Amino acid sequence: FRKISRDRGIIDKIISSMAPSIYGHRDIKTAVACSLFGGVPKNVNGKHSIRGDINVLLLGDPGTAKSQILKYVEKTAHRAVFATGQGASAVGLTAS
Amino acid sequence: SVLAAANPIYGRYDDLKSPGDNIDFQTTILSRFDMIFIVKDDHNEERDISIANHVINIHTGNANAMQNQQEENGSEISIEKMKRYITYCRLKCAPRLSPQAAEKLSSNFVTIRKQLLINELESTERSSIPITIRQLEAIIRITESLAKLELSPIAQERHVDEAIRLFQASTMDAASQDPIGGLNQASGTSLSEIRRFEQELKRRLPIGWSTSYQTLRREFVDTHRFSQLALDKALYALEKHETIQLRHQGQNIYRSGV
Amino acid sequence: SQYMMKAVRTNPMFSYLDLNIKRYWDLLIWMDKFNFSGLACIEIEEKENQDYTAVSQWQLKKFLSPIYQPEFEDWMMIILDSMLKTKQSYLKLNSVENSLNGFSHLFSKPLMKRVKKLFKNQQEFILDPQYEADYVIPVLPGSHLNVKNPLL
Amino acid sequence: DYYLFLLRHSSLYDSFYYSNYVNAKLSLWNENGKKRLHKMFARMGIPLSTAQETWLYMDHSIKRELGIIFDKNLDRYGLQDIIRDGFVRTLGYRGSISASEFVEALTALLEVGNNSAQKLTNLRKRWVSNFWLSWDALDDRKVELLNRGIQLAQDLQRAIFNTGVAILEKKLIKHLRIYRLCVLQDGPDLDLYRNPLTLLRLGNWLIECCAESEDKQLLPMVLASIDENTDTYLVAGLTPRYPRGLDTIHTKKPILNNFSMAFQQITAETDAKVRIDNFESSIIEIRREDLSPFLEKLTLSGLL
Numbered sequence A: 001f002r003k004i005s006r007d008r009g010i011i012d013k014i015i016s017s018m019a020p021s022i023y024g025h026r027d028i029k030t031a032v033a034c035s036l037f038g039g040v041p042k043n044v045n046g047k048h049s050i051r052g053d054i055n056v057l058l059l060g061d062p063g064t065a066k067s068q069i070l071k072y073v074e075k076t077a078h079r080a081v082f083a084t085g086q087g088a089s090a091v092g093l094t095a096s
Numbered sequence B: 001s002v003l004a005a006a007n008p009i010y011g012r013y014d015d016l017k018s019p020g021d022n023i024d025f026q027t028t029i030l031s032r033f034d035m036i037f038i039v040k041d042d043h044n045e046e047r048d049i050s051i052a053n054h055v056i057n058i059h060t061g062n063a064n065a066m067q068n069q070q071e072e073n074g075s076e077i078s079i080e081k082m083k084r085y086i087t088y089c090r091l092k093c094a095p096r097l098s099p100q101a102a103e104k105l106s107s108n109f110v111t112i113r114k115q116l117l118i119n120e121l122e123s124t125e126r127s128s129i130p131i132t133i134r135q136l137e138a139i140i141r142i143t144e145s146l147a148k149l150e151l152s153p154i155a156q157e158r159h160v161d162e163a164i165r166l167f168q169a170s171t172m173d174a175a176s177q178d179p180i181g182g183l184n185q186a187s188g189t190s191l192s193e194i195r196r197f198e199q200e201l202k203r204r205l206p207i208g209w210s211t212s213y214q215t216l217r218r219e220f221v222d223t224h225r226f227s228q229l230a231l232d233k234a235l236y237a238l239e240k241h242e243t244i245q246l247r248h249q250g251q252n253i254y255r256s257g258v
Numbered sequence C: 001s002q003y004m005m006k007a008v009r010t011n012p013m014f015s016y017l018d019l020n021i022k023r024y025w026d027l028l029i030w031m032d033k034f035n036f037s038g039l040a041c042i043e044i045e046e047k048e049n050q051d052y053t054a055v056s057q058w059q060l061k062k063f064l065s066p067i068y069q070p071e072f073e074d075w076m077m078i079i080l081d082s083m084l085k086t087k088q089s090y091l092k093l094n095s096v097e098n099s100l101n102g103f104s105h106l107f108s109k110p111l112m113k114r115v116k117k118l119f120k121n122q123q124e125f126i127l128d129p130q131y132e133a134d135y136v137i138p139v140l141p142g143s144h145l146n147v148k149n150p151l152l
Numbered sequence D: 001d002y003y004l005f006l007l008r009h010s011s012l013y014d015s016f017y018y019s020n021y022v023n024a025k026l027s028l029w030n031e032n033g034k035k036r037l038h039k040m041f042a043r044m045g046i047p048l049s050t051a052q053e054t055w056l057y058m059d060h061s062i063k064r065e066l067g068i069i070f071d072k073n074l075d076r077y078g079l080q081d082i083i084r085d086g087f088v089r090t091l092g093y094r095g096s097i098s099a100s101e102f103v104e105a106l107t108a109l110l111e112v113g114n115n116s117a118q119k120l121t122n123l124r125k126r127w128v129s130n131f132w133l134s135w136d137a138l139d140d141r142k143v144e145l146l147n148r149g150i151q152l153a154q155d156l157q158r159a160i161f162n163t164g165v166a167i168l169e170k171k172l173i174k175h176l177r178i179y180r181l182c183v184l185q186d187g188p189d190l191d192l193y194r195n196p197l198t199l200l201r202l203g204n205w206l207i208e209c210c211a212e213s214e215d216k217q218l219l220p221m222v223l224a225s226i227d228e229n230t231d232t233y234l235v236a237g238l239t240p241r242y243p244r245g246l247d248t249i250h251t252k253k254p255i256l257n258n259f260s261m262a263f264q265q266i267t268a269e270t271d272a273k274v275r276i277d278n279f280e281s282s283i284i285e286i287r288r289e290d291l292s293p294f295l296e297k298l299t300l301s302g303l304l
């Protein structure tokens, strides 16, 4: 890891390695990579908390491989949960 | 005590529509809140830059390196010290009003309750934000709370003025939304009379020179064109930044632009 | 020009105005009335290539250090020449005024080297008391800025 | 005793973590040094949970046999030089204090406690005021001030470590032919380095880190720190040091500090806006504009 981390253009290869079999849509891949790696949460003097995670939205025409990208993100992530449409409730995405 | 936060319908306040179509809280629940704050964004550049710098200083670590110093010197106190001060004040003091404070509060209540009548008669619809006796008791409570800070055993006019100003900033501002135009039954003739009066005023008065409200009333009303609602028409023309300016303690009406 | 003058004079609003054309400009750089430069001709002639004079009135130069005031004028005289050359090339060839796209390419490389050399000389001689005559910021009526680095 | 930072008033892990010698010998600023320290603590037989407890409440059996554990294991990692003898003072049913901890508490009390000419005057007045705070801590009646000094020392060492890792990771040290330059222009808590003692702390950290480096050189170092309020750099010259455990064949009168003569020579010849008024002649205050040219002259000055 530390050997390959100092190569120039590691970010480009990481982006190119996201969902390789899907063609194009490089901005979606960049957003997915940024969400996967994530930011850094912060706490200022123990009274002001700042979130450190990135949320992504995909609004597009039918037949553009959005669901396959979601499945790839599910597979790659360490902890992943999947839900769809009317199959989820108020307390099914929350505590009951 | 209750501290509540909420969003309006449609997300943003949507100042284009009526206040009654923006707040879904009924009058029953809105009368139990002493202070109501309606919060809006103004999108000014200077404020945006100041806020951006303030937020970036928080993230880059420059925040703490400043804050401790002020907390050290004389301008801030820690959370625990303020907690202990709050409990000491609440368990030690309970102020009382003075005879002059009641006299100053009664007149303010009468004024703020009179204004609502004119607003409701002009808009021919009931106000969404209500003013009641609870609104007088709220100002009394705020005055006594202000007195409590100094451990004073009596509340005086100094605290009454600040309580009145806070109430004006919080609830009277929310009540007085002052819709520029709603295209409703109220001011129905004004829908054309506004343009009529604007044309009559812009043909009488070239881009230079000034007039007076006294003359603009007497002469334009001798022809029986008065509507009793022309007080805000001049301000609306002023909002165009060209039609009208008010100078010399509001006496002088100056034509400034197209 | 004659058609515009006749049209303006024809209007009853401006029947009594006196209008005279003083100069014709080929290339003009305008900031304000006290800061401008370009190429102008007093009056156009026939069958002779028009004589052009180059003018440059820059009050902005007065607030510079004595060693850099000649450099300001010298580099403006290169900017104007390059802009004229690229405008002539664009005219000959045939959202953006394509007459002046790419003029900076001719004088960029020399300017970088000159700036580097001037910076090296400034670093070498700024603290020398003998050269204290140079690097002195003038005081002029209406000057307010308090600034530190002369080459900047 | 041991070459450990405040052993009797903090944990064992903290003593090994914030030590100049251990950091120099193991490079704790990155992940490899921390992993090596964890491996060492695992080998020695002390559970990682126990090594993070307070010294008073640490397990009695481990405390009793600390000497044997040090003697038999420290040799593998090159830390056999941390064992030494010192002086410990005890007064009644109070607790033991070593001389090293006492001097660090005193230094911490010196450092922190309690239109630009006035700004510098107020700082110098506060520095004068801290003298009586350090003076009071030498009396047996005032022990709370000694405890406050210990806490201040812990915080100061943490800040020094935090700045040093940033300096070392971004390669801010520039290796010139005659000396090595380090200028701190941006970052948090640059208001701690307006005091000469804190800059000497950071310089001692860096010199200790460089002495144990395999690179063999004895070049002096220059450390510069900005103060935004005064718009002045405070600049200090630091002499190189031989490794702590090296033999006595090189031992002599130590390397001589030649920054005073160079600074005087440069100041006399040019009308630089420098202030050489501290008792230590190797510390100067130079205006922001003059820093970049002045150093260039120093490059050609020599004697360094």
Ligand SMILES: Nc1ncnc2c1ncn2[C@@H]1O[C@H](COP(=O)(O)OP(=O)(O)OP(=O)(O)O)[C@@H](O)[C@H]1O
Pocket (backbone or CB within 6 Å): A021, A022, A023, A024, A061, A062, A063, A064, A065, A066, A067, A068, A069
């Ligand atoms: N470059 C591509 N762009 C779009 N679809 C692609 C591409 N390459 C392959 N496909 C295939 O096209 C099909 C359409 O993809 P998909 O079912 O995800 O579409 P969708 O409209 O985004 O789906 P949904 O409504 O479930 O969110 C899939 O079988 C996918 O594997």
